Design an enzyme around this catalytic site. Structure first.
Site, PDB file in Angstrom:
ATOM      1  CB  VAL A 105      -0.934  -0.119   1.217  1.00 29.50           C
ATOM      2  CG1 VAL A 105      -0.110   0.580   2.541  1.00 29.50           C
ATOM      3  CG2 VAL A 105      -2.520   1.106   0.716  1.00 29.50           C
ATOM      4  CB  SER A 106       1.367   4.051  -1.978  1.00 32.50           C
ATOM      5  OG  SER A 106       2.565   5.129  -1.411  1.00 32.50           O
ATOM      6  NE  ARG A 107      -1.078   4.951   5.901  1.00 30.90           N
ATOM      7  CZ  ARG A 107      -0.184   3.548   5.790  1.00 30.90           C
ATOM      8  NH1 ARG A 107      -0.250   2.736   4.990  1.00 30.90           N
ATOM      9  NH2 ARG A 107      -0.845   2.708   6.366  1.00 30.90           N
ATOM     10  CB  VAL A 108       0.715  10.001  -1.209  1.00 28.66           C
ATOM     11  CG1 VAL A 108       2.076  10.225   0.035  1.00 28.66           C
ATOM     12  CG2 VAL A 108       1.971   8.542  -1.865  1.00 28.66           C
ATOM     13  N   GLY A 109      -0.874   7.720  -2.625  1.00 29.52           N
ATOM     14  CA  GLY A 109      -2.465   7.429  -3.647  1.00 29.52           C
ATOM     15  C   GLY A 109      -1.612   8.120  -4.841  1.00 29.52           C
TER      16      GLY A 109
END
Lengths: 140, 156, 277, 177, 105, 140, 140, 52, 52, 52
Positions: free
Chosen positions: G5-9
């Site tokens: 996953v990545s927080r920024v998207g």
């Protein structure tokens, strides 16, 4: 038989026993290829029915009662009686009675030769196969 | 667990790594075969519980080809050693590098789907699996070979 | 780490409940479909008493069917007759003849269209969804009269017992194609019979071999359906034994990881207490 | 002319060459029949084995002495050693006789064999005994059969079959014994 | 459990009899000796039992024997923690047991 | 139900419950052994489906709303109305007018006699089976 | 992909990639949801089999070599050619060589205008659909 | 497990619990549709064993 | 309540995904069955011709 | 799963033997005779072996 090894005392083995147990652990090796899926898993092929009715004979050959150790010259004759095919007529229920009848009815002079020579000499397996065809195996 | 199958040397092919397994070091032809051997051995490991609890009859016909090829190369990774010949009896086999890449191309492409699985067990080269597949079928024809009688030797 | 083996135990435990419930489902289906197999065995007997049994005939066209299962948890049934299909088809096709391969059951339409795709003209399925009826087997046999071959090979598993399933081939020779010629014994074997029908014998034999096709196709997919329920009853006993050996081994793997866990964090507490005390 | 002897034991000679020896020989429906037609016998006097069959039920396999079958040229009786006959049956009453008693199944068609070894075989698709038939529903359907006239002769192939089946069913119970 | 052995040993060594000895839940003998070892500041063994687990059990079970004067036979109720026979408390107890009587529901 | 034990057992329970709940835990134990069959479509030989529908209506006989405990004589009747075969074997669209309909329509005299005697006497189940058959539920 | 996953998207990637990788993160989720249903081989109503053919063509797109990174304009064109058409009749064994047609044989001035714009303009969406039919992929 | 199916917010519908889920507080119409959703979602969790 | 009692089996399954009210899934099934009735024309009058 | 009907001749004699072996493993106890009426039995080892 699959997990138990000894790679140091394999060179320090009684010859004659080394001659006939090379066949015994080779036939018990392919007996473990027919392990628990004889017909229990899917089906039966009836061509390797022979090794299932021989690995069960080599299994019953190695069973032994407690507190009764056998001399080595009388063990290799009981494996020569089993690995060559002198007990194929004997049903699997009476093999412990058959090999006990093998050592008792074969004359005791052959055990002095195999102990002293230390190997199954080509003079000895003639008289061994002569003495192994004139024993009264139970049943059959 | 590889050693309990009888495969010697008991090397895990999906746990052994090397920094040399790189196509710019060993050549792209040697590298693509090793990654193809590891591909069908991982695909056989993904099926290991479906084959356990349901058998091989539930697999696809494109996955039963994956199982049969991977059961062949994990016998073909087995090899007899020159230091194990004392307690196993079989002589040791030194396999050249080009004989290994060419031998493992054939089982991946499908050149040796004719041979049985146990013909690959404990042989050196891909020459020796063909010569063992013959010996496994000369010997089942050797049940009808002859009746050996030992006669007239007692006074010799 | 220790929860992944805990709920995987929960996976194999009720798979062993599924495959033990499925075995009695397949055994209850085997019991009620066993009496229909014995009743359908009667009518196939007068036709091999009359028309004989000629498997190895020389034809120019042949429709071969392979009667497979529909749901594929049978474990070695539908794959075995596809081995017996090509072992029978390639035995009888060396004359440069036409061959149409039909399959009853959609486990054959996934298995025969990859080994014989150039000769596969029909796929029939859902024949066991409600029951096998003679009118259903008549419409299946009617689509085998669209093509007009000289033989009809029927590959199916004969329900010998709940343990053994003999794969059986059965051939139906077309009347004016090959049936009138393969009964010639210094004249004919069929000329001993007095035809007491409406039109001539070439129309009686056309009505009889369509009847003989529809009777032995009704019996084939009924014999094969009872062999499907009885091989699923054995393939699911081998699944409870496999998911009870997997569960017994994974219980000991959890118990070793349970005992190692209580030993590990306890050593972490003593090592933190001996640093202070 | 018999230069091509196809057969169950002759299927195995070509099957041992092209098909491998890994599989056992496939079975044949002749291997499940204890009774044939060309080997004589099975009469031993005034009786003969009668096998009356539907696809869903074996109705008789005993030995009788008189079987009355409704052939398309009319009813005919079969004694112990009848002539070998392949008789197509119309809708009518198959009548069995083992003695003084008789069972009257009404059949819908389907053939009937008499074999040179004296055995006989009746092969119908639906055989209802007349106690399972009620005549109130029979000619009410013939009133629906012989009244509608579609000139599509696939439908009056079925309607002709509907007429002769229902009309032979009316006289099957109205001519009671 | 040592108080019960001492009454059993008088009937064995002085009366010269064949004594029965019932130890209700031999695991609770083990569990109580594990608590005494933990209160004395000793470092626990495998999973949390006493380090002297084989010798505190073995000190009890070796006094249960047949001698020249009499005998003591022991019927010990055995609890198995978490139904794990490889747990060190039943596995140490099973090395002393000469028989096993399973009562089933 | 399978994991909850009581070592005192039935020796310290209601005697009007002890003869009724003695078979309730026995039909519930059979329901746990065939609980995988409940999720099936192909119905089996009706000796197990008799367990699967009686057992699944016996678990609904033990459901209870919060902060509303039931007297003991009203519980032994509601389990008598499910273990003796007075079950709602009609289509179970109508649950809300048929669950509480036992204790609300059966006359309150049988609760007084069951509480005072502590036991379903032979002179009491003759009216309990008489009162259970005259359940109205007239909204259906 | 199911665990990374990545927080920024959004708002921290290429705007041209954000149009074509949104239908890749979505469509690879439909590939993993059917991979636990690939042991039976029923493949009903052409839905669980079509995404099994396209989702297998998207994981082979993301495979790349070592010590050879790709510019973002050549990455958003290679995944443009897989979430859209232009690779629907390519075998799943030679997609890794198929992008060498997509990178080299497509006119390399479509990368310069895609690098300078940042997004796939509809004036460039026409040329990216035009020049992806002008290439001959060697998959056969 | 809810987040890996793409469902957001990834709230476990069974494992989530509140003191307000009570028919004396939120009414028996809000309460019964809440218990009805948890009934059909627990039944789906027990059916996914036999679907695979 | 409508999904529980059965009012909205008329709607497809993934129309309920990432919506708000019950009047948004009911209109997402309108858009979902327009757009699958698209992708029918593949000949011309699209964006890929250069002279527009 | 099949029934007592199709059991073999050598497989339903052992059923009829093991059913009465396990009845003869039961025994009344003297300590339980004070509330069960039936008296208890002390069985010697010589009578247990020949009895089985």
């Amino acid at each position: 038989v699959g997990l138990s090894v000894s790679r140091v005392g394999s060179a320090a083995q009684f010859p004659g026993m080394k001659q006939v147990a090379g066949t015994l652990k080779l036939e018990l090796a392919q007996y473990r290829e027919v392990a628990a899926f004889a017909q229990f898993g899917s089906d039966l092929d009836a061509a390797t029915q022979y090794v299932l009715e021989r690995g069960a004979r080599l299994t019953e050959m190695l069973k032994q009662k407690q507190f009764a150790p056998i001399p080595i010259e009388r063990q290799t004759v009981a494996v020569y009686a089993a690995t060559k095919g002198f007990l194929d007529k004997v049903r699997v229920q009476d093999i412990v009675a058959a090999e006990e009848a093998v050592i008792s009815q074969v004359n005791p002079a052959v055990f002095k030769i195999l102990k002293a020579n230390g190997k199954i000499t080509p003079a000895l397996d003639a008289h061994l196969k002569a003495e192994l065809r004139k024993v009264k195996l139970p049943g059959a | 667990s590889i050693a309990e199958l009888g495969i010697y040397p008991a090397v895990d092919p999906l746990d052994s790594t090397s920094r040399m397994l790189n196509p710019n070091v060993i050549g792209a032809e040697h590298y693509n075969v090793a990654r193809g051997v590891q591909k069908v051995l991982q695909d056989y490991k993904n099926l290991q519980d479906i084959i356990a609890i349901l058998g091989m009859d539930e697999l696809s016909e494109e996955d039963k080809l994956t199982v049969a090829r991977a059961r062949k190369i994990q016998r073909f990774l087995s090899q007899p050693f020159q230091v194990a010949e004392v307690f196993t009896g079989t002589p040791g086999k030194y396999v050249d590098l080009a004989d290994t890449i060419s031998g493992f191309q054939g089982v991946l492409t499908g050149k040796y789907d004719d041979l049985p699985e146990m013909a690959f067990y404990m042989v050196g080269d891909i020459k020796e699996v063909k010569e063992k597949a013959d010996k496994m079928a000369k010997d089942i024809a050797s049940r009808k070979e002859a009746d050996n009688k030992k006669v007239s030797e007692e006074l010799k | 780490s220790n929860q992944a083996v805990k709920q995987r135990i929960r996976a194999i435990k009720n798979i062993g409940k599924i495959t033990k419930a499925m075995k009695m489902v397949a055994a209850s289906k085997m019991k009620n479909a066993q009496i229909a197999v014995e009743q359908s065995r009667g009518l196939v007997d007068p036709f091999v008493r009359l028309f004989g049994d000629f498997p190895a005939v020389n034809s120019n066209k042949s429709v071969v069917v392979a009667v497979t299962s529909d749901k594929g948890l049978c474990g070695g049934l539908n794959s075995n007759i596809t081995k017996y299909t090509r072992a029978t088809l390639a035995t009888t096709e060396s004359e440069g003849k036409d061959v149409v391969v039909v399959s009853i059951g959609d486990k054959g339409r996934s298995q025969l269209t990859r080994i014989e795709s150039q000769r596969y003209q029909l796929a029939i399925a859902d024949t066991y969804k409600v029951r096998v009826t003679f009118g259903q087997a008549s419409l299946i046999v009617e689509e085998l009269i669209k093509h007009n071959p000289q033989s009809y090979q029927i590959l199916f598993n004969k329900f010998r017992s709940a343990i053994s399933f003999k794969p059986t081939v059965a051939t139906i020779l077309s009347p004016d194609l090959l049936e009138k010629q393969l009964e010639d014994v210094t004249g004919n074997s069929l000329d001993a019979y007095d035809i007491e029908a409406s039109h001539e014998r070439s129309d009686v034999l056309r009505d009889l071999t369509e009847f003989h096709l529809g009777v032995t196709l009704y019996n084939a997919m009924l014999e094969n359906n009872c062999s499907e329920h009885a091989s699923r009853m054995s393939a699911m006993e081998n699944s409870t034994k496999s998911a009870g050996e997997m569960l017994g081994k994974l219980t000991l793997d959890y118990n070793r990881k349970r005992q190692a866990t209580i030993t590990t964090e306890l050593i972490e507490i003593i090592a933190g207490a001996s640093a202070l005390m | 002319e018999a230069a091509a002897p196809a057969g169950p034991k002759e299927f195995t000679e070509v099957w041992n060459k092209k098909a491998p020896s890994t599989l056992i020989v496939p079975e044949f429906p002749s291997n499940y029949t204890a009774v044939k037609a060309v080997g004589e016998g099975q009469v031993h006097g005034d009786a003969f084995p009668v096998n009356f069959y539907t696809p869903h039920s074996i109705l008789s396999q005993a030995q009788k002495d008189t079987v009355v079958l409704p052939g398309v040229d009319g009813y005919f009786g079969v004694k112990a050693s009848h002539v070998p006959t392949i008789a197509q049956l119309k809708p009518g009453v198959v009548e069995l006789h083992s003695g003084a008693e008789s069972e009257k199944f009404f059949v819908s068609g389907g053939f009937a064999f008499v074999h040179p070894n004296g055995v006989t075989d009746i092969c119908v698709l639906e055989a209802a005994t007349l106690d399972q038939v009620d005549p109130a529903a029979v000619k009410s359907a013939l009133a629906a059969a012989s009244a509608a006239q579609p000139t599509d002769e696939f439908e009056q192939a079925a309607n002709r079959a509907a007429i002769e089946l229902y009309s032979a069913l009316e006289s099957a119970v109205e001519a009671k014994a | 459990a040592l108080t019960g052995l001492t009454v059993a040993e008088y009937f064995r060594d002085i009366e010269g009899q064949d004594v029965l000895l019932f130890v209700d839940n031999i695991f609770r003998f083990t569990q109580a000796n594990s608590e005494v070892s933990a209160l004395l500041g000793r470092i626990p063994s495998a999973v949390g039992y006493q380090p002297t687990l084989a010798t505190d059990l073995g000190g009890l079970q070796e006094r249960i024997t047949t001698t020249t004067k009499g005998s003591i036979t022991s019927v010990q109720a055995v609890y198995v923690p978490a139904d794990d026979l490889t747990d060190p408390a039943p596995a140490t107890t099973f090395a002393h047991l000469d028989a096993t009587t399973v009562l089933s529901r």
